[PDB]
Ligand code: HEM
């Protein structure tokens with residue numbers, strides 16, 4: 001399988017900035033979602049989920065094909081709750097029907113991150129919608145009740161090393177877990193719709209208590225009222241992951257640069273960008289544009 005990036009015919013930077021702006025304005029407007037958290041977090045998750053089905057071994061899955069739009073994928077148990085981000089984006093796609101699905105799902109995550117004060121994430125267009133049959137089977141997304149070895153191993157399938165895994169996990173500072181969705185409940189910090197290194201700080205500074213939740217699943221609960229999944233907790237159990245946690249707890253910039261590189265890589269996995277392809281775009285946030 002080779003998936004070559006193909007620019008939406010005759011669209012340029014300016015065209016994409018517009019899609020961005022549309023997402024951004026809508027994020028601003030629909031702020032009541034999930035008790036005032038907003039749709040930022042769910043979009044980040046959407047982008048990650050359409051991208052994590054990737055398999056470095058045969059090149060199946062990944063964001064290119066926009067397969068999330070098909071039933072098999074959309075109904076994946078691991079994607080429970082993502083339907084809210086889809087619906088959010090739907091009117092957007094209607095406004096700009098020439099964008100591919102993969103491009104839109106991915107752009108929304110980038111947009112989400114940046115509007116939430118995160119770092120700038122360079123983004124590339126060119127994903128192409130593929131047929132129903134290119135839809136990966138369910139089961140390629142990770143489980144939350146495991147440990148550091150699982151995480152290490154899981155992530156390797158995506159070509160991500162230790163440093164990338166830890167940077168990527170910091171997105172867990174955002175949003176929260178929802179019982180009806182994954183059998184987990186609670187946020188992991190206080191700033192859950194602003195992008196920061198909070199995840200790392202919480203992991204190192206709170207006093208976590210293992211407990212079983214209403215769904216009969218274990219989770220690490222803190223006095224402050226926050227939670228961490230076993231997989232999140234595992235970053236402090238592994239000696240190699242811990243030193244990285246500590247690095248990010250200490251320097252938000254390092255965290256931002258690393259996250260940026262990794263998120264882009266995650267969203268570009270499985271895609272071949274030809275030689276003449278435009279460079280990656282760096283979108284202006286609403287604020288940078290005075291909108
Ligand atoms: C071991 C790896 C991962 C596991 C097991 C995992 C599992 C989960 C779980 C169980 C939830 C809660 C879903 C719900 O009930 O609504 C979730 C939430 C979240 N996931 Fe992950 N995740 C991991 C990797 C990542 C990464 C790499 C990203 C992005 C870079 C991320 C982004 C998030 C976000 C932003 C939310 C909050 C969603 C919301 O507030 O609706 N996770 N994760």
Ligand SMILES: [K+]
Pocket residue numbers: 171172173174175176177187188
């Ligand atoms: K969270």
